[PDB]
Design a protein around this nucleic acid. Sequence first.
DNA 1: GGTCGGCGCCCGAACAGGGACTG
DNA 2: CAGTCCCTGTTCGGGCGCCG
Lengths: 411, 555
Amino acid sequence: PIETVPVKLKPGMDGPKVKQWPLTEEKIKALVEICTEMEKEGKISKIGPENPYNTPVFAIKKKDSTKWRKLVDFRELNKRTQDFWEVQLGIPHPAGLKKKKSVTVLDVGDAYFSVPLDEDFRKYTAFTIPSINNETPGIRYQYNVLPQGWKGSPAIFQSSMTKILEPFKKQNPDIVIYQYMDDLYVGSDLEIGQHRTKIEELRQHLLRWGLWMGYELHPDKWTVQPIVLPEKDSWTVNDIQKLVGKLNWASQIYPGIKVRQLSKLLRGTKALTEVIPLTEEAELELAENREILKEPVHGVYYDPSKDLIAEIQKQGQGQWTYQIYQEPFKNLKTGKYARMRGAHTNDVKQLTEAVQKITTESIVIWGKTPKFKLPIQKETWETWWTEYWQATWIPEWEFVNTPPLVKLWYQ
Amino acid sequence: VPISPIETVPVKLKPGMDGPKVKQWPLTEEKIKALVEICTEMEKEGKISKIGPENPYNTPVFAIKKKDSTKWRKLVDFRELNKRTQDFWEVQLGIPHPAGLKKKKSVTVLDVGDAYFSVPLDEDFRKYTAFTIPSINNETPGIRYQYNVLPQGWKGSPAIFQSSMTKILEPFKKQNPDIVIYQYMDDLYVGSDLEIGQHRTKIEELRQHLLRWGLTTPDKKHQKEPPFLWMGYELHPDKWTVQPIVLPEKDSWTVNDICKLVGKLNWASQIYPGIKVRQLSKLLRGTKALTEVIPLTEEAELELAENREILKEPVHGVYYDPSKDLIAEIQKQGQGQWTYQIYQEPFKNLKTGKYARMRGAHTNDVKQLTEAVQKITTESIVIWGKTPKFKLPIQKETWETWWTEYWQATWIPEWEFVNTPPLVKLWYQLEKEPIVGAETFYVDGAANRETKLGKAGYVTNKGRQKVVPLTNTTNQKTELQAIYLALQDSGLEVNIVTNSQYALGIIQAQPDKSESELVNQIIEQLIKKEKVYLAWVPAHKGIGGNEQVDKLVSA
DNA sequence: GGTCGGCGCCCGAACAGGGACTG
DNA sequence: CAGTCCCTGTTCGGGCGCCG
């Protein structure tokens, strides 16, 4: 008996038409049971081929979770409904969420099923469930309520969400709560003990309204990866060559970098393994360049109207570096991950875990998901990435093949 | 007109576009009799109805012969209607494969007679399916009908039938969950582990459940005894095989004949292991006319004779056993060619196949092997919903060296080494640190964008030097040429310093094959060496001999 | 014959993005 | 400086195979 919020696509744009990719047996059985139950609860209803729209669907398991979770790739739908959840019903982003000692994420996707969807918009939420060996044609459904993973769901439910959170926000005014997609980020400076207690207070405060998760973050312990120069006591020709190339590349970021005196040491046609003593003018150019790398870049600041972009480099031995920027060489944040799940054996798993950690950090700091430049072939990524996904959101990505130049981000 | 028992599918035209208004083709007198005989019969059965001048739409119509029968089939050239009709989402996501079938006690195959003619069309959409039937006299006005069912030749008919058919089978499948029904259009593969007595009962229960909605299951198309003919195969209680394949034996081959040959060889490669189409597909490159005669090359005739000899012996596949693991084994066959076999017990193949796509101007066997693994993995998840265990002709240390040092993310699922030559291996390893006591070469190359002329040479720490004039070249080709010279004139251990990102990116990818003959020569020189160390320095920075050799090759 | 849809292969041509060099 | 071009990869259009 709830009124529907009318939603429209962006002008001059049709709905998504993305084919469904093959799914494993364990995922198909998980989707069949969930879709059968959701159809019984009226959340979805079967449709036919007259609906020309479709969206890929697959299943996941969150970290340390046994139950399967239905996940839909609405990226294309979210790209074709962008003006709704940014202009009309936008959500503010708390700048203090990233400064908290502890931040916990909660899957509040089940609450969206309590609100019906606009009847004219149900046509675009269409998806298909494949069968093993194509035993049967595709079993199609469409959503009758607010779908999980749609960027219009948290905007419509925002007014209902604020009234649920007002009794808890008034009791605990120093706690910061942010809502992105199907997740709720609750941050506080409380001690770890009473922090988890206040979460369970909110878990029960949400259960009484008709709604459970627990992933802990510590943004105050997030570190950046700076560009560092080696501290050798004896330098060879090859060392100084690599040093100049790295300092030459870093000059695009720090305009004050100079390699004039160091290049003078490479005047002759010397053997690479030959030891070269550093001149007095070169030792000062080396020390001044180290100090410049300590300084922050001049004129770097976040633009809310610009898209976030993230690049990742495979540094070997379980090492992965990354940089987040909106304009080239104006990196908002750098970093490095080490010894993730699948280290020393599976890169796709490490690359998937790295995208998740980076995206999570972007949500906490700016409230946006970056577009990724992934160091992997397209077919290699599209084959294995779903097998290691553990998040309810999906960032956008593209594939690059930049051979290693001169190790700028890792020693 | 009576109401059909099946629920109709609402269909619209695209917004702002009207029905078709196109004139009828001139028809031969033999096809006109076949159409009028079929049109008058379908009008009596309520499948087409007469229309008057109030219907302003029209579309052509013709008829083709049915295979191995005197009956004719009525087809409508709905090319203009298909353009303005709404887009449908096809529910047929793929084609089933016998390798995914599980051993069932009893099997039954049936095909419904005239499938489309049993499913109704949307009432509001019947008006746009208007066509004229020309008479034996050109002056006779002609009989205009409109469809009441799914017209054969319409783009919406297959998508509508497959969805309408699944809706009718759901009540039976819901009551009979342990029954397996492979549904492809009108083809129903019904298998179960029930005893053969209760199996025939459930078969007749379904033949009446389908009859309630106007779907006839003729006993002519009924199949109770093995072997069953299902989707172009022969299903036996323990094994399956494709229905026989026939290749043309042309004395003079055109381009279309090779395409028909290549297509059947690709279809045969599913169970016929070792089929190669490399030398035959080389006949299709850079050719324009479909009817152009092409002579067979010596390498192409040998490949065809080998494929004919494989098709002589009988091959058969087995069925999937979910209790045992899935295994896939690959073999390097030819350069750029790979074959594989998927099985659970040795020599009992579920299916075979081949991978031969050449990706990139530069590649190696390790890249091609990884591409083949992914192609098999996707193919397996389609048919069995799982990833098989791999037996790969590559050393465990060989692969460990590759993926750990490569800058791209790359990974292969659970696999084990099989010692089947030829083995995939890296042909050279670039040193990580500069070689002590090795001559150090500073190479560079340049070219003029207009004259297409340039130089390429090197300078070493031992005073050695060389510069070579080059004609009809580019900046990229010269920088590769400079490295080729350094590799030619050096010993077994050599340090090379370049400023070419282009050249350094190609070599560090450890390629063993290339479309460029220059890269192939650089590869051949890298294999002969024992230790090679490449390095990159920025150009125009006054670095080492890289500035001395940049000035020599400047022009 | 020159109807529709699905999947697969092969090739060329179109598109498209990133470097290096030049007015 | 933007305008090229040299290179390389990707997407697509059009043929065959096969099934319904």
